[PDB]
Amino acid sequence: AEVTQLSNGIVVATEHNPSAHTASVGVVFGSGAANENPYNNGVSNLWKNIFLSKENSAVAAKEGLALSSNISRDFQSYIVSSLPGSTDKSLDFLNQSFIQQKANLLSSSNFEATKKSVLKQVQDFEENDHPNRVLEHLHSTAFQNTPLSLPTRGTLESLENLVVADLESFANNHFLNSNAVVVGTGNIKHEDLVNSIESKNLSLQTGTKPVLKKKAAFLGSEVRLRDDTLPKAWISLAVEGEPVNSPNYFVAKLAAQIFGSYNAFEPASRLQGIKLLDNIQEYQLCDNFNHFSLSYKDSGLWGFSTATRNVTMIDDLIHFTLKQWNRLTISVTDTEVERAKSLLKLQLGQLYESGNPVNDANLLGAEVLIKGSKLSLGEAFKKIDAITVKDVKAWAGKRLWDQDIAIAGTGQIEGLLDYMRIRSDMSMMRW
Amino acid sequence: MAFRKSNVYLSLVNSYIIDSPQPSSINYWWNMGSLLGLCLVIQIVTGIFMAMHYSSNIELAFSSVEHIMRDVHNGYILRYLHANGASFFFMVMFMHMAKGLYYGSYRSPR
Amino acid sequence: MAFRKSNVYLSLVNSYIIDSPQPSSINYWWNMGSLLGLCLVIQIVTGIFMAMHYSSNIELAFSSVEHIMRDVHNGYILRYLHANGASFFFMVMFMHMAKGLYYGSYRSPRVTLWNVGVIIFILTIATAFLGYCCVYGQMSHWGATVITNLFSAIPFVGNDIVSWLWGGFSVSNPTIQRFFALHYLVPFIIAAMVIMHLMALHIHGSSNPLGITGNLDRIPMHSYFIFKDLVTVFLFMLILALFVFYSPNTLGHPDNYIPGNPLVTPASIVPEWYLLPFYAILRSIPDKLLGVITMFAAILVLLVLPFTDRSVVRGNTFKVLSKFFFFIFVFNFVLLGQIGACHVEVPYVLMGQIATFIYFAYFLIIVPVISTIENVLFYIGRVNK
Amino acid sequence: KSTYRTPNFDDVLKENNDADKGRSYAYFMVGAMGLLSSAGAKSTVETFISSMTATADVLAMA
Amino acid sequence: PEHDERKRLGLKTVIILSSLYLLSIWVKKFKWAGIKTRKFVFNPPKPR
Amino acid sequence: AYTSHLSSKTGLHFGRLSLRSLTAYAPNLMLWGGASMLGLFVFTEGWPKFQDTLYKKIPLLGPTLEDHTPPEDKPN
Amino acid sequence: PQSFTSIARIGDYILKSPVLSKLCVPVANQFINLAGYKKLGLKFDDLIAEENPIMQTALRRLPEDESYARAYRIIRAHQTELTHHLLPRNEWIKAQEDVPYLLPYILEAEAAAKEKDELDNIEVSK
Amino acid sequence: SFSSLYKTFFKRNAVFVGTIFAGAFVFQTVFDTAITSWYENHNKGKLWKDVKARIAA
Ligand code: HEM
Ligand code: HEM
Ligand code: HEM
C-alpha cells in the first residue's frame, strides 16, 4: 500500500490515501535526542522550535501551509502540511526555508526569542507536567550514562548554554542525505512526489552522521524525586523491553496489552477484563495506570506508569501490579491473550490508520528509517494473531521473571518502598 | 490490600518485623535486642528440655543435673547451652542497656 | 483525649474491657468466655502453688500429692480447687462451644475465631490429660498406658513415636517427669492462644442471640457487662465452692487414690469425665489406627461446620428443626460420655457406634440438609406465588 | 546541576553486567547460606528430639 | 566423659557457624548495597 | 464475513481456583512435593528406622552412615 | 452460604407445582409461626446475616425509607429480647406485612456477581 | 551457559529449595564423615580402637 524508493541520494517514502483531504509532506531524520551529549541537550528541541518560529510560520501560512515538527529519541521530523493540490509549494518551502536557506531562521533576535521560548516551555514542563517528567526520569535512570537517557525536551541547564553555532553544528552533523527520509502521506502519489523531488534539486548534505561510541544499555536503578507539596504520587516502573526489529516486539506489545490501561474515574474502564482491578478496586489503590512497551533503535522499556492519591498504600499498588506481572511467566490464561490480541489489533489500527496525515508521516518516516521498509497492517495483524500463550510465557521468562527494574517517581512517594523490596516482587516463591 | 496486611495476626507480624520502619543509620548496637530475643528463646527451649529430666528435691537436684550431664543424650549440650546462654543473655543485656545509656534511648518519648 | 485511650497499654485494656462495644441483646450465655478466663486464672495460680510442693519422680508423685493433701497448709484447698476447677473449666468450655454451635458464631466473619477456639480446645484437652497423669494414681498410670499405646497403631513409626513419648519401654519415671514439664508449659501456650482468641474476637465483635447485625444498638462493656459477668463469676465461684468444700471427690474416680501399680489392671480403665465422649468415639471403631484417627476427627470435625452450615440466617434462634437437632446432638454427647464410662459389653458397643455415627452425621449430613430445608421453608412461607 | 545528570556510580558498578551471571552469583551465595542453615537446623532439631528419646540409664535396664 | 564427642561436635559446629557467618556477611552486603551506595542531590526549590 | 455473536464457554472453576490455573500450576506442585520429600529426607536422616529402610540403600552415602563398632566395646 | 438464587429456584419450583404447593406451603406457614421472629417485630429479611458483600451491596441499594424502618425493627428487636419479653400482640408483624423487600435487591446483586464470575472464567471458542 | 544454569536451577523456587535440601543431605553425610575421619586420624594412638589393638598384640 505504501511505496518507498531510494532515489540517487535520498529515500522517498509515500503512503498514498485518496480518501484523505490533506497531504503532509516532510523530511524525517533518523537522529533524535539519543544523538546528543549531556552538554548540548535540547538542541533538537530548539531546531524544532525555530522550524516553528513565527518568522518561519508566516511564510508557510501565507501560502496555505501548516508546519508540524516532532522530536523523539530516535527520529526527528519536519513536516509541512497542505491541501492536495499544494504539494509543490510544500516541497518549495521545505527546500528553501529549512534545507538551503537555513541561516535566516538562525539569525540573532530570532534564535534569542526562540531560546527564551523553549526555556520558559521546558521550565513549565519541569514544574507542572508530572507524569511525563516521571517517564523522562525513568529513561534518565534506566539508561544512565548512555545515549538514550537524554530527555527530548532538553534540560534547563544545557538549554541555557546553547548558541547558534551548536544548532549549526548539529545541523551539519545530522541533517544529511544518508540520514533523511522524505515522506509523503495524505493523497499525493509516489510517482508525483518523486517527480517533484527530481524536478527541484533537493539535496541536504553529503557526509555521514557521527557513530555513537557506546550502545544503549539498561542499568537497573531508581530515582526518587519526592515532593511533599504535590497532591498525588506519580511512579513509573519498568524492565528492559525489546528493541525495535526484535522478534518479540509484538509479543512485548501484546503483554503490555494483557494488563492494558485504566482510568478509575471512567465507569467503562472499571469493567475491563483485567484481573488486577479486583485487587485495586477494593481500597482504590490507584487513580490511573497505563502499561507501555516502548522500543527504540538500541533497546526498549516495558512496564507501567501510574498515579494515585492513596499515598499510604503505594506498596499494595506496586505489589499487586508486579504479582500480576508474574502471571505472564507462570499462569497467563488463553482468554487474556485473546482479549489482548483483539485490543492490540484495535490499538494498532487506531494508531496507524487515523485520519491525521501528520502522525502517519511520523510513523512512516521512523519505520522506514530504522527498518528500511514499512510493515503493513495486515502482516502486523498476522504476526499478532500468531502469538500463542507459550510465546508470552517464554518472553516473560526471558524479560520479566526476576529481572532488574528501573523505577522513577515524584510527589508523595514516601509510601513507595526502596529498591530491593520492590525488586523482590519480580519473582514469587512459587505461590 | 496484601494478605500480610489484612490478616489479624500477620498484620502484627508485618508491622513489627516485616514492614516496621527502621531508620537507615542505626548500627550493629541495635542488633542486641534481637539477640536478646534469640537468647530468651534458647533459654526457654533448653530449659524445658532439661526440666523434662530435672528432679527438684534437695536429695535429687545435683544428682539429676549430673544425670542430665551423663545419661541424657546430648544433655551436656542442653546444660552448657543453658548456663553459657544465661551468661551470654546477661552479656548482650548489658550491651543493650549500655547502648540505651550511650545513645540516650531513655529520653522524653521513650 | 483520655489517658485510658492515649496510653500504650491502657488503650489495650480500654479497647478490650472498658470501651469494647458489645451488642445490647446478648444474654448470660455470653458470660462463659469470661468464666473460662476465670477458670484459667484459677488453674494457673493453684497449679503454681502446688508445683512449689509437688515432686515429679515416679516414687514421689503420689506421695507428694498426698504431702500437699496432708502437710501443706490449705493444700487440700489448692488440690481440690485445681481438680474440680479443671472439671468446671471443661463444663464452661462445653457451654462456650455449644453456644457457639447454637448461635452460629462460627460463620463467615468469625471462622478464624472458631478455628483458634478449636486449637484452644485441643490444647486444653492435652493439658488435662498430662495433669491427670501427673498424680500417678491407678487411673493415671493406666490412662497414660492406653492413650499413649494408641500411637503404636501408626504402621510406619508407631513404635518409635511410642518409645519416644514414654522415654523408655513403658510409662515410667521419664514419662511422668516429661508430663510434668509439659503440664507446666502448655497452659502458657493456652494463655497466648487466648490472646489470639481475643484478637480474632476483637476485629469483628461479638454476636448476639438474634443473629442479626449488632452495629445499631451497642453498649460499652464496662459498667454493664462487667457487673453482668460479675453475677456469673460469683455463681461459678459458689458452685465451685460447693464442689470443693462439700463434695470434693464426686467428679474424681476413686481409683486414683491407689498408688500407681504397673502390674495390676484396675478392671475398668477410664479417663476423666470430660474426655469420656472422645474415649467412646475411640472405642467405637474396632481398629486401633482408625479409632485414634476417628477420635482426632471427632475433635477436628468442628472445622467443617462453617462450610456445612448452609443457612442464610445465623443461629438456631428462629429455626425449629435446627433447634430440635441441636439438642439431639447435645444429649447424644451426654449419651456418648455415659457410654464411654461403661464397660465394653453387648448393648453398649452398638449404642456407642450408633451414637458416634449420630455425632458425625450432625455436622456432615444433618446440618446441611436441615438448613437447606429451612431455607426453602423460610422462602415459601412468605413468598406468594 | 540537573536531575537528569545521574551521579558517578562507576566505582561500584561491575564492568560486565550479564544478568544470568550476576544472578547465579547472588543466588549461589543465598543458596549456600540456606544449605548450611538447613544442615544446622536439622542437627538442632535432632539434638532436642534425641534428648527427648531415651537415656542410657534405662537402655541398660532394657 | 563426653569430652571426645564434645570436641568433635565443636569442630563440626564451629566450621558450620563460621561459614554461615561469612556467608551472612556477604548476603548482608549484597542486600544492603542498593542502600549503601545511595546519592542525594539537593537543588533548592523556588520560593513561592 | 460479519460476526454478530461472541461464542464462548464458561470454563471450569471453584470460585478462585480454575482448572486452567490448576493445569498451569500442577508440575510445579509436583516439584514442591519432591522438594518437601527431600526436606523430609534431610530432617529424618538421624532416624535409624529411616536409615535402615531408606538411607543405607544409597550407593555412595549408604554404608557411610552405618557404624563399625564390634559387640565387644558396646555396653548394650 | 447457600445462594439466594438457588433458594428462589427451589421455592419457585415448589410454588409453581399444584401438588407441592398444597403439600408444603402449610408446613412452611406453621414453620414460620413456630419460628417466632414475628413476635419480636422482625420481618424475615431483617434476619439475613449481612456480613457478606452481596448483602452489603443489597443493603446499600435499599431505598431509604425501608432502611430507616429496618433499622427501627432491628433496634426494637434488640431491646425486646434484652428485656426478655416479646412485643404486645398488636405490635407483632402481621402475615401480610412480612413481604420480601430485600429479596429483589439480593437476587439482582447475586445475578450480577455470578455473571461477573462467569465472565472472569470464560473460555473463548477458538 | 550461565543462561542454562540460571534457567535450570534458579528460575523456579521449588527446584531451588529442592536443590538446597538435596545438597544439605549430601553435605550432612559427607561432612560428618570428613570431620569424624579427621578427628580420629589426628588422634591416632589415643583412641580406644588403638588401645584395643595394642592389647590384642
Ligand atoms: C529467662 C531465661 C532463663 C535464664 C536466664 C535461666 C538461667 C538459668 C541459670 C543461670 C541456670 C543455672 C545453670 C547452671 O549453672 O547449671 C539455670 C538452670 C536451670 N534452668 Fe534456667 N534459665 C532460664 C529459663 C529457664 C526455663 C524457662 C526453665 C524451665 C523450663 C529453665 C530450667 C532450668 C533448669 C531445669 C535448670 C537446672 C540446672 C541445669 O540443668 O542447668 N530455665 N537457669
Ligand atoms: C490449663 C489449665 C490446667 C488444667 C486444665 C489442669 C488440669 C489438671 C488436672 C485435671 C489435674 C489432676 C487433678 C487431680 O485429679 O488431682 C492436674 C494436676 C496438676 N496440675 Fe494442673 N492444670 C492446669 C494448669 C496447671 C498449671 C499451669 C500447673 C503448673 C504451674 C499445674 C500444675 C498441676 C500439678 C502440680 C498437678 C499435680 C497433682 C495435683 O496436685 O493436683 N496445673 N492439672
Ligand atoms: C480458654 C478457653 C477460652 C477462652 C478464655 C475464651 C474466651 C472467649 C471470650 C472472652 C469470648 C467473648 C465472650 C463470648 O462471646 O462468650 C469468646 C468468644 C468466642 N469463643 Fe471463646 N474462649 C475460649 C475457648 C473457646 C473454644 C473452645 C471455642 C470453640 C471452638 C471458642 C469459640 C468462641 C467463639 C465462637 C466466640 C464468639 C462467640 C460470639 O461472639 O458469638 N472459644 N471466647
Q: Annotate A331-378 with DSSP letters as a single string.
A: ---HHHHHHHHHHHHHHHHHHHS-S-HHHHHHHHHHHHHHSSSPPPHH
Report the phi/psi class of residue C167: left, alpha or beta, with left for phi > 0 and alpha for psi in -120 to 50. Answer: left
Q: Cell numbers 453475677 correspond to what residue?
A: C231
Do residues C209 and C315 make contact, with C-beta atoms less than 8 angstroms apart? Answer: yes
CATH numeric code, H1-57: 1.20.5.260
Interatomic CA distance for residues F39 and A173, integer angstroms: 65
- Residue whose CA lies nearest to ligand 1 atom number 19: B47
Exposed / middle / buried, residue F54 (Cβ in 10 Å: 0-12, 13-18, 19+): middle
For residue A137, the SS3 value is helix
Residue C334 CB neighbour total at 10 angstroms: 11
Q: Which residues of H touch A402 (CB under 8 A)?
A: 11
Interatomic CA distance for residues C356 and C338, integer angstroms: 13
Q: Which residue of E has its CA nearest to D23?
A: E30
Grid cell of D53 as nine digits: 528419646
Interatomic CA distance for residues F37 and H21, integer angstroms: 9
Domain ranges of chain H: 1-57
Domain ranges of chain G: 1-126
Fill in the amino acid letter for A26: G
Interatomic CA distance for residues B10 and F73, integer angstroms: 54
Q: Taking Cα atoms as reference points, which of A299, A300, A274, A301 lies closest to residue A289?
A: A274
The domain spanning residue D1 has which CATH number?
A: 1.20.5.270
CA-C132 nearest atom, ligand 2: 12
What does DSSP say about strands A11-16 and A222-226: parallel, antiparallel, or unpaired? unpaired
Buried b (16+ CB within 10 A) or exposed e, C301-328: bbbebbebbbbbbbbbbbbbbbbebbee
Q: Cell numbers 456469673 correspond to what residue?
A: C232
Q: Do A403 and D19 touch (CB under 8 A)?
A: yes
The residue count for chain F: 76
Q: Do A330 and F24 touch (CB under 8 A)?
A: yes
Domain ranges of chain E: 2-48
> What are phi and psi for residue C122, nearest 5 degrees?
-65, -45
Query: Residue C202 catalytic?
Result: yes
Distances (CA, A) of A196 to A22, A25, A64, A68, A82: 17, 12, 19, 21, 15
Q: Of chain A residues 341-400, which have a CB less than 8 A from chain H?
A: 397
Grid cell of C199 as nine digits: 484478637
* A76-82 sheet: strands from edge to edge: A3-6, A11-16, A180-186, A23-29, A76-82, A66-71
The number of domains in chain D is 1
**Declared resolution, Å:** 3.3
The domain spanning residue C318 has which CATH number?
A: 1.20.810.10
Task: Give residues with Cβ within 8 angstroms of C54, minimum separation 6.
Answer: C61, C64, C65, C68, C134, C180
Report DSSP state, residue E45: P
Q: Give the gap in angstroms from C-alpha B35 to the nearest C-alpha of chain A.
A: 24
The number of domains in chain C is 1
Residue C110 CB neighbour total at 10 angstroms: 24
The number of domains in chain F is 1
Question: Which value, to the nearest 10 degrees, does the dihedral of the CA atoms of residues D29, D31, D34, D39 take?
Answer: -100
CA of B85 to the centre of ligand 1 (A): 9
**E2-48 fold:** 1.20.5
Sign of the dihedral defined by the CA atoms of residues D61, E4, E7, E13, in that order: negative
Fill in the amino acid letter for A246: S
Q: Which residue of F has its CA nearest to G115?
A: F10
Which range marks the domain in which residue C217 is found? 1-385
Q: Which residue of D has its CA nearest to B73?
A: D51
For residue A79, the SS3 value is strand
Residue C7 CB neighbour total at 10 angstroms: 12
Interatomic CA distance for residues A254 and F36, integer angstroms: 37
The H or E element spanning position C309 is: none
Spot the catalytic one: C105, C229, C311, C322. Answer: C229
What does DSSP say about strands C218-220 and C21-23: parallel, antiparallel, or unpaired? antiparallel
Interatomic CA distance for residues A100 and A373, integer angstroms: 28
Q: Cell numbers 540460571 correspond to what residue?
A: H6
Closest ligand to the CA of C130: 2
CA within 13 Å, CB half, A182: 31
For residue A26, the SS3 value is strand
Q: Taking Cα atoms as reference points, which of C353, C143, C166 lies closest to residue C268?
A: C143
> What are phi and psi for residue C68, nearest 5 degrees?
-65, -40
Among the four given CATH numbers 3.20.10.10, 3.10.105.10, 3.30.830.10, 1.10.357.10, the one describing domain A1-202: 3.30.830.10
Task: Give residues with Cβ within 8 angstroms of C260, minimum separation 6.
Answer: C58, C61, C62, C136, C137, C138, C140, C141
CA-C185 nearest atom, ligand 1: 30
Q: Of chain F residues 6-35, which have a CB less than 8 A from chain A?
A: 8, 18, 20-21, 24-25, 28, 31-32
The residue of F9, F20, F22 whose CB has the most chain G CBs within 10 angstroms, and thus the best one to mutate to test that interface, is F9
Q: Taking Cα atoms as reference points, which of D60, E9, F41 lies closest to residue B74?
A: E9
Report DSSP state, residue B68: H
**Apex CA C273: angle with CA C271 and CA C274, to 5°?**
105
Buried b (16+ CB within 10 A) or exposed e, A333-364: bebbbbbbbebbbebbeeebeeeebbbbbbbb
Grid cell of B28 as nine digits: 550493629
Report DSSP state, residue C362: I
Residue F46 CA to chain centroid, in angstroms? 19
**A208-431 fold:** Cytochrome Bc1 Complex; Chain A, domain 1 (3.30.830)
In a domain, D60, yes or no: no
For residue A87, the SS3 value is helix
Which residue stretches of C135-172 are H helix? 138-149, 158-165
Q: Taking Cα atoms as reference points, which of A285, A279, A280, A289 lies closest to residue A310?
A: A285
Interatomic CA distance for residues C250 and C252, integer angstroms: 5
Which range marks the domain in which residue F23 is found? 1-76
Q: Taking Cα atoms as reference points, which of F52, B75, C61, C162 lies closest to residue D57?
A: B75
Interatomic CA distance for residues H31 and H28, integer angstroms: 5
Does chain G reach chain F with at least 3 CB pairs under 8 Å?
yes
CA of C36 to the centre of ligand 3 (A): 8
Exposed / middle / buried, residue G109 (Cβ in 10 Å: 0-12, 13-18, 19+): buried
Give span(s): CATH 3.30.830.10, chain A. Answer: 1-202, 208-431
Please write down the HEC assignment for all residues of chain G.
CCCHHHHHHHHHHHHHCHHHHHHHHHHHHHHHHHHCCHHHCCCHHHCECCCCHHHHHHHHCCCHHHHHHHHHHHHHHHHHHHCCCCCCCCCCCCCCCCCCCCHHHHHHHHHHHHHHHHHHCCEECC
Instruction: Work out the angle between the directed axes of helices C367-380 and C320-341 (0-180°, nearest 10).
Output: 160
Grid cell of G34 as nine digits: 413456630
Task: Give residues with Cβ within 8 angstroms of G59, minimum separation 6.
Answer: G50, G67, G102, G105
Grid cell of G97 as nine digits: 406485612
Interatomic CA distance for residues A131 and A134, integer angstroms: 5
Exposed / middle / buried, residue B33 (Cβ in 10 Å: 0-12, 13-18, 19+): middle
CATH architecture, domain G1-126? Orthogonal Bundle (1.10)
Mutate to test the pocket of ligand 1, among B50, B54, B58, B82 (most ligand atoms within 8 A of CB): B82
Q: Cell numbers 480447687 correspond to what residue?
A: C81
